[PDB]
Coordinates of C-alpha atoms and ligand atoms in Angstrom, one line a residue:
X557 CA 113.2 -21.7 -121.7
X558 CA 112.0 -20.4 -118.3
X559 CA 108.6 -22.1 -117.2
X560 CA 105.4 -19.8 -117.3
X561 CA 102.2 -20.4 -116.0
X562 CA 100.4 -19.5 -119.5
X563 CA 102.2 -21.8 -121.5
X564 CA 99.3 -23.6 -123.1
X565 CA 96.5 -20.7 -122.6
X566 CA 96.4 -21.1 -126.4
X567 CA 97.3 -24.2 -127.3
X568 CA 94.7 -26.2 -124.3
X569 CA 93.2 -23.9 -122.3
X570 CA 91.0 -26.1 -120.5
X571 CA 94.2 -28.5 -119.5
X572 CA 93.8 -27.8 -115.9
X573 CA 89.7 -28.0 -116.2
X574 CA 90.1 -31.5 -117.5
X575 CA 92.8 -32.7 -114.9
X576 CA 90.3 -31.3 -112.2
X577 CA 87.6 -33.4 -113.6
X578 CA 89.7 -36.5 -113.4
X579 CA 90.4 -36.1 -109.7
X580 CA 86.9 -35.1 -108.7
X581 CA 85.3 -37.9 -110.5
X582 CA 88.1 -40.5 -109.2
X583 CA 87.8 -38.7 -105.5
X584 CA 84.3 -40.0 -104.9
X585 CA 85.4 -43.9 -105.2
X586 CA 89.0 -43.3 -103.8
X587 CA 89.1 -40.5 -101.3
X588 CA 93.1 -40.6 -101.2
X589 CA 93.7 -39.7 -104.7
X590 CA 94.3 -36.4 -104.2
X591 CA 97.1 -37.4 -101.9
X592 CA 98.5 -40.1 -104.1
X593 CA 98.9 -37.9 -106.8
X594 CA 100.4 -35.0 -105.2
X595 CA 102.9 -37.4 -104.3
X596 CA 104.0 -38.7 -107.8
X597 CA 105.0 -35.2 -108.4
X598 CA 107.0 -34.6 -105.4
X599 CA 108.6 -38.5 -106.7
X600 CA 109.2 -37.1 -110.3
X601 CA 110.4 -34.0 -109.3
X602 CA 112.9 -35.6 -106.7
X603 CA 114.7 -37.7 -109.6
X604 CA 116.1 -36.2 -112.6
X605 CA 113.3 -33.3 -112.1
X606 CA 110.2 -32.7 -112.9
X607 CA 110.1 -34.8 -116.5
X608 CA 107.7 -37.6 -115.7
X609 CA 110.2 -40.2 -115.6
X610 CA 108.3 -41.7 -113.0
X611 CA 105.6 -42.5 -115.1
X612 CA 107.5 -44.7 -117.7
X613 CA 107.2 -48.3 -117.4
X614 CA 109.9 -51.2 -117.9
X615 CA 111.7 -51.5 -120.6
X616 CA 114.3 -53.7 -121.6
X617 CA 117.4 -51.0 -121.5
X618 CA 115.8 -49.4 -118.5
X619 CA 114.1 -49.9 -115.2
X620 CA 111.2 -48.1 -114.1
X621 CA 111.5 -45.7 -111.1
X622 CA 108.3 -47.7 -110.0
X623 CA 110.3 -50.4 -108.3
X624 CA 112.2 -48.2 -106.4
X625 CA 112.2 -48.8 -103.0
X626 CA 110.3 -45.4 -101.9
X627 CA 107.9 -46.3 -105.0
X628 CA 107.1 -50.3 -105.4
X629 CA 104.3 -51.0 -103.5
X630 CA 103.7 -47.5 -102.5
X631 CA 103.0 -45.0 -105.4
X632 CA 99.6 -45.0 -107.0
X633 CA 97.2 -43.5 -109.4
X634 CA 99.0 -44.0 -112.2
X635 CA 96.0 -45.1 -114.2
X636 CA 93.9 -41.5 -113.0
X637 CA 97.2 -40.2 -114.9
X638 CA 96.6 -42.5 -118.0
X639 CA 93.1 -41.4 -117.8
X640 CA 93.3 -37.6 -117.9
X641 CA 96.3 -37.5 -120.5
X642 CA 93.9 -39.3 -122.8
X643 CA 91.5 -36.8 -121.9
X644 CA 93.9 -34.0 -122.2
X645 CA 95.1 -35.6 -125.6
X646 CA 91.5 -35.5 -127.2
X647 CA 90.8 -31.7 -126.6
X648 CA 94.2 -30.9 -127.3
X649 CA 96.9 -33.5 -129.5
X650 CA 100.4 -34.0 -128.9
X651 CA 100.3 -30.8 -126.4
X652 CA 100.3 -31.0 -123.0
X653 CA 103.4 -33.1 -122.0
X654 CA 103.2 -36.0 -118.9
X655 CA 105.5 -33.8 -116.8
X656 CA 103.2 -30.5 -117.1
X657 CA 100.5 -32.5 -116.9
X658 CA 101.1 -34.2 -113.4
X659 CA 102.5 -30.8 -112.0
X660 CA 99.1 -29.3 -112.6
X661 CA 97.5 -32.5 -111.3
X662 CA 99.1 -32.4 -108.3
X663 CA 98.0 -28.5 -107.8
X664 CA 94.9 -29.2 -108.3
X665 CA 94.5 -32.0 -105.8
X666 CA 95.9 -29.9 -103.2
X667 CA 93.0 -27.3 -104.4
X668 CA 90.4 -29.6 -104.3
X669 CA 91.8 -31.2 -101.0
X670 CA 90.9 -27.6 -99.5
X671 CA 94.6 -26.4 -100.2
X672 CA 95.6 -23.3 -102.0
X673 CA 94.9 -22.5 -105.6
X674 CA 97.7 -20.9 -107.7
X675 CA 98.6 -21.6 -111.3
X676 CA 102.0 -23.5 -111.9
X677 CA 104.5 -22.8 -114.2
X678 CA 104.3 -24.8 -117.3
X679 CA 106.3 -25.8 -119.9
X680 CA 108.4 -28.9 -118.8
X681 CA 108.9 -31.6 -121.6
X682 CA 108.7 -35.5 -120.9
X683 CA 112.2 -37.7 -120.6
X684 CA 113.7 -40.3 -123.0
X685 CA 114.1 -42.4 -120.0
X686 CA 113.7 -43.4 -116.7
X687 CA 115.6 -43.4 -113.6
X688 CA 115.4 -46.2 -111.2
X689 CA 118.9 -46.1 -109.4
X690 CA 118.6 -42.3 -109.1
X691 CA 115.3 -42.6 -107.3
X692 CA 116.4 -45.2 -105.5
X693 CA 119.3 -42.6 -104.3
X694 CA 117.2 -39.6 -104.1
X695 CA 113.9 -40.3 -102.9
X696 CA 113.9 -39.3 -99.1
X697 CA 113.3 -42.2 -96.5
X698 CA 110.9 -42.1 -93.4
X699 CA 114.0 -43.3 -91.0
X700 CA 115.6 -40.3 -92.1
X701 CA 117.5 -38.0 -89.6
X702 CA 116.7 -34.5 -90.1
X703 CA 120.7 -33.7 -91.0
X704 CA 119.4 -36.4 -93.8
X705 CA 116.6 -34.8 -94.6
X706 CA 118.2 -31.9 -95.5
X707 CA 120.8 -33.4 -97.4
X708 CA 118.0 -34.9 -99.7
X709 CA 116.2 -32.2 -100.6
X710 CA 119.6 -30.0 -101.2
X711 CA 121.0 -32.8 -103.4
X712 CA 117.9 -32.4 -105.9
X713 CA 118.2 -28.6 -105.8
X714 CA 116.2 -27.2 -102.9
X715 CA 118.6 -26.1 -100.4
X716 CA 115.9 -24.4 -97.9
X717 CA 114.7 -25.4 -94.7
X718 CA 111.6 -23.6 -95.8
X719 CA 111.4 -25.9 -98.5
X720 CA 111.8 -28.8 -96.3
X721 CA 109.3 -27.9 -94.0
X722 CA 106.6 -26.6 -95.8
X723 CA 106.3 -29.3 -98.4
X724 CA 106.8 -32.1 -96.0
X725 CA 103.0 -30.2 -95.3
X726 CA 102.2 -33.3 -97.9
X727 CA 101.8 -35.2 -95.1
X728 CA 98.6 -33.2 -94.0
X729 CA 96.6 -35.7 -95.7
X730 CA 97.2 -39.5 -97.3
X731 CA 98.3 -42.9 -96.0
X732 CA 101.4 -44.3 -94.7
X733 CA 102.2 -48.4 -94.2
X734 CA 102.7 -49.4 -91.0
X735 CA 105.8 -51.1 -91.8
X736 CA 106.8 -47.4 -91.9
X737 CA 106.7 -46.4 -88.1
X738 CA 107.2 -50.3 -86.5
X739 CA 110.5 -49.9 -85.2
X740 CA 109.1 -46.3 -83.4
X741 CA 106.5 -47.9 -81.9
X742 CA 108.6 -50.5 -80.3
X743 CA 111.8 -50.6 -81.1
X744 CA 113.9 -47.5 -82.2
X745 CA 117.1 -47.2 -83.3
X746 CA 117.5 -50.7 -81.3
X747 CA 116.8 -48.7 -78.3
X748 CA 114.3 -51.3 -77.3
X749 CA 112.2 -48.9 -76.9
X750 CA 109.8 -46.3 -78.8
X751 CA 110.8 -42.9 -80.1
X752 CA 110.5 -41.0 -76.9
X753 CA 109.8 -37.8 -79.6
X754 CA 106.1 -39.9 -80.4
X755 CA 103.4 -38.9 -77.7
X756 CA 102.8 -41.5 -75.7
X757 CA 98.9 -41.0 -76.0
X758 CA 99.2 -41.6 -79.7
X759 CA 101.7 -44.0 -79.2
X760 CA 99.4 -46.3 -77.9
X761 CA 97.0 -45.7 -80.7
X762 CA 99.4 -46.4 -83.2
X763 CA 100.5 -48.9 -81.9
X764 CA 96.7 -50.7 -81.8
X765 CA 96.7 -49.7 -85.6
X766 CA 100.2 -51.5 -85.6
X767 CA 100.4 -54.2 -83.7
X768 CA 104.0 -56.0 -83.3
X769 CA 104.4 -59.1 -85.8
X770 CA 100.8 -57.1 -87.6
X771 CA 100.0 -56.2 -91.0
X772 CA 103.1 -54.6 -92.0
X773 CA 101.3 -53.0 -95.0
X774 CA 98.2 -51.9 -92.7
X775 CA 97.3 -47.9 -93.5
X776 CA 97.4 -45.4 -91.3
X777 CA 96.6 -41.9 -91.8
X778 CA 99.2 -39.2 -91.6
X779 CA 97.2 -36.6 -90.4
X780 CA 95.4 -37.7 -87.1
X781 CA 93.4 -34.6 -87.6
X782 CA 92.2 -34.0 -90.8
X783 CA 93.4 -37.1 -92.6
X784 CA 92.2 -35.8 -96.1
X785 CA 91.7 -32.4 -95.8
X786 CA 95.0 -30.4 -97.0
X787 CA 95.5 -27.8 -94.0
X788 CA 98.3 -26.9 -91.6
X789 CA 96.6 -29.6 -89.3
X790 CA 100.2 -30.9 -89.7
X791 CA 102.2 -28.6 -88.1
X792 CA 99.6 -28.4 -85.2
X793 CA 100.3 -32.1 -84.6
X794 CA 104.0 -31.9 -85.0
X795 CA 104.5 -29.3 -82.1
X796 CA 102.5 -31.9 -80.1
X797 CA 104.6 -34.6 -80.8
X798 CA 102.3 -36.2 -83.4
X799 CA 104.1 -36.1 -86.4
X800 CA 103.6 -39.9 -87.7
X801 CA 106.6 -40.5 -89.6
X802 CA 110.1 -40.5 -87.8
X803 CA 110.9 -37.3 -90.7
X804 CA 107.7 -35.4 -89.7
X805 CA 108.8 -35.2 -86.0
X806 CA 112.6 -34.3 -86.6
X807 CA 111.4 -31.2 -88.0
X808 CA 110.3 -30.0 -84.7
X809 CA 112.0 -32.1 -82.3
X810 CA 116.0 -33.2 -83.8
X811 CA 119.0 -31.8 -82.2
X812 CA 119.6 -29.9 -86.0
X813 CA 115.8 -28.3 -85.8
X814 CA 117.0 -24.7 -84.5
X815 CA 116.3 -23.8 -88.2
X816 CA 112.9 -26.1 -88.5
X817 CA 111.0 -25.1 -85.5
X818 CA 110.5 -21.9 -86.3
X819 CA 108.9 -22.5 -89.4
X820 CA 106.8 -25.2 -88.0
X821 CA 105.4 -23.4 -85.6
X822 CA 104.7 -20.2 -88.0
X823 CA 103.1 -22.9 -90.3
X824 CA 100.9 -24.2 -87.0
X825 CA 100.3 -20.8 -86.2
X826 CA 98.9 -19.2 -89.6
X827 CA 97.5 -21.2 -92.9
X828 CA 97.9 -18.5 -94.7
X829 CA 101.7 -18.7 -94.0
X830 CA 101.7 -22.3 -94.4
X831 CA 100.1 -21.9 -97.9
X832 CA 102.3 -19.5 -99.0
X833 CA 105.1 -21.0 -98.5
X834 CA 103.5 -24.5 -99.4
X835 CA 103.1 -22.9 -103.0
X836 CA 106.8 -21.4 -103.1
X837 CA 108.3 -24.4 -102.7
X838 CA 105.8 -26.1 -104.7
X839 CA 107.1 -24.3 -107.6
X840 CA 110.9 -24.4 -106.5
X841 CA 109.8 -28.2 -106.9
X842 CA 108.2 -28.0 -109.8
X843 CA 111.6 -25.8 -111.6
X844 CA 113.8 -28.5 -110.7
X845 CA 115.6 -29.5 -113.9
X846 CA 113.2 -29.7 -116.3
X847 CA 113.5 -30.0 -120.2
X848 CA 112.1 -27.5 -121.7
X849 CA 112.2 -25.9 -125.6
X850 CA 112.9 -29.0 -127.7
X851 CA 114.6 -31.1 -125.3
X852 CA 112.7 -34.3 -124.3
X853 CA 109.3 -34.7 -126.0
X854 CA 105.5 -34.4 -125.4
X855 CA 105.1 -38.3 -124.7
X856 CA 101.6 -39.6 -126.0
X857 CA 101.1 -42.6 -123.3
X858 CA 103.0 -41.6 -119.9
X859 CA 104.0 -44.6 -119.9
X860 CA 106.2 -45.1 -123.0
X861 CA 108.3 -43.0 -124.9
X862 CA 106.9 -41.7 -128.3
Ligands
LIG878 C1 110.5 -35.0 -96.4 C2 110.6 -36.4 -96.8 C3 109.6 -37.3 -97.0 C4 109.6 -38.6 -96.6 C5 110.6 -39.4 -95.9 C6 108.3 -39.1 -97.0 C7 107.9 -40.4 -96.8 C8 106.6 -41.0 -97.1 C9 106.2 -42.3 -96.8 C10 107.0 -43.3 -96.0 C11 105.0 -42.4 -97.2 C12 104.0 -43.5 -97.1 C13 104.2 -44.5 -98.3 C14 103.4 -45.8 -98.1 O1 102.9 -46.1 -97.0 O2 103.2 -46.5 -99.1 C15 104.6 -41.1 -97.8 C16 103.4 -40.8 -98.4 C17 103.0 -39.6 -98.9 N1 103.9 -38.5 -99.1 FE1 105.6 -38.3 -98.2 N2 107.6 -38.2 -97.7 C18 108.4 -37.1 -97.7 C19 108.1 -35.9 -98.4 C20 106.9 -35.6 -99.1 C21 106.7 -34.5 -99.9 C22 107.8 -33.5 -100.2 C23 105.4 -34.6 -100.4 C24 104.7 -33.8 -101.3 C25 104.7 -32.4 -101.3 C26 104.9 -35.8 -99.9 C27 103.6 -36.3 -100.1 C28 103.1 -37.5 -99.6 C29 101.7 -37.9 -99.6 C30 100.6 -37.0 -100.0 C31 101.7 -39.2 -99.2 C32 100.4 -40.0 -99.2 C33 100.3 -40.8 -100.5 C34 99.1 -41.7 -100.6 O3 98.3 -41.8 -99.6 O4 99.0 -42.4 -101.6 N3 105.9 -36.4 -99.1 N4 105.7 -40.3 -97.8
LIG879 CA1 111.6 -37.3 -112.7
LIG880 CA1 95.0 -32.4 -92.8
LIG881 NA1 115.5 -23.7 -108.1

């Protein structure tokens, strides 16, 4: 059954009103919500698709995807989730499944991050199960070379650069560890040296956030910028050498990037490009394998099946 963006205009029409509640009352006590949730889509999507695996806790046939490496001690919000599917459930019962509903949370805090605003397809259904060696496979690491970049995002289905680029634009706002970016700030690749791609100007700021033998799980923000505004602030940074993570920067400065420097610098160059093409691959994302029909089920808790 192919995804529509009306899919529950009659049976919860409000859905996405109450999900933007959630996040503007949670925004006001924890700023990088918005951020945090946009980002367990892009981890549910990236692992079985878009079925809200991610959300399902232990069990004793099955791990959860939440201690996976590019989850434990990383992804959050999972309670803001609980929350508005309990919300979601009172106006409308046994409707709105998990998966839908974290695809339109994650739209709407890029909207109320200052992003675009679009309506996602809907439709998805929730899994019987979750998937902890498969996101322990698929999810992308920060040490990633751009050839591996690539090969992650076409292994789960999304075979464009464009793709690659644009939603690695994620990284416009939220935190990242500084366990993350040690090993550029002083020794990369066993150079013994930093990433000559980092700007030595914000080298030396990062590496006073970061100090050697420091707080591994210190945060720092991805976006020296506009840190929680969702903007093509980004791309700006990248062509400057300022992408934090070793991932943003090979998009505009690794050997393969002949295809990825053009659409960085289009995406620095115009929001308006950047947010059209943020939302096209948002919803190649969001069609990644979903259940859909009667397949899987409209979970009541995300984080058990029914
Ligand atoms: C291209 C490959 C990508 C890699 C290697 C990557 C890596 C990471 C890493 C290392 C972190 C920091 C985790 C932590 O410190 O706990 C992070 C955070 C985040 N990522 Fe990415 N990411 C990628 C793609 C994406 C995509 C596709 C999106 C969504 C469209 C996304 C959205 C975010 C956001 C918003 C955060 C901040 C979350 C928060 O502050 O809670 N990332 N990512
Ligand atoms: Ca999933
Ligand atoms: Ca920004
Ligand atoms: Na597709």
């Amino acid at each position: 059954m192919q995804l529509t963006p009306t899919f529950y205009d009659n049976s919860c029409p409000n859905v996405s009103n109450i999900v933007r509640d959630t996040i503007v009352n949670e925004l006001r006590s924890d700023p990088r919500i918005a951020a945090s949730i946009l980002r367990l889509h892009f981890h549910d999507c990236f692992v079985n698709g878009c079925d809200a695996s991610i959300l399902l806790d232990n069990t004793t046939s099955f791990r959860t995807e939440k201690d996976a490496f590019g989850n434990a001690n990383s992804a959050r919000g999972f309670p803001v989730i609980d929350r508005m599917k309990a919300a979601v459930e009172s106006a409308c019962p046994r409707t709105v499944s998990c998966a839908d509903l974290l695809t339109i949370a994650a739209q709407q805090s890029v909207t109320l991050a200052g992003g675009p605003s679009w309506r996602v397809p809907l439709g998805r259904r929730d899994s019987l199960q979750a998937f902890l060696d498969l996101a322990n496979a698929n999810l992308p690491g920060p040490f990633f070379t751009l050839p591996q970049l690539k090969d992650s995002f076409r292994n789960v289905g999304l075979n464009r650069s464009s793709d690659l680029v644009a939603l690695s634009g994620g990284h416009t706002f939220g935190k990242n560890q500084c366990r993350f970016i040690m090993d550029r700030l002083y020794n990369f690749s066993n150079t013994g040296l930093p990433d000559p791609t980092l700007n030595t100007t914000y080298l030396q700021t990062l590496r006073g956030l970061c100090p050697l033998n420091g707080n591994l799980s210190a945060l720092v923000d991805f976006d020296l910028r506009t840190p929680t505004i969702f903007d093509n602030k980004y791309y700006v940074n990248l062509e400057e050498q300022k992408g934090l993570i070793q991932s943003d920067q090979e998009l505009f400065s690794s050997p393969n990037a002949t295809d990825t420097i053009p659409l960085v610098r289009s995406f620095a160059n115009s929001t308006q490009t950047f947010f059209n093409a943020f939302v096209e691959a948002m919803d190649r994302m969001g069609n990644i394998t979903p259940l859909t029909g009667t397949q899987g089920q409209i979970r009541l808790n995300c984080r058990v099946v029914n």
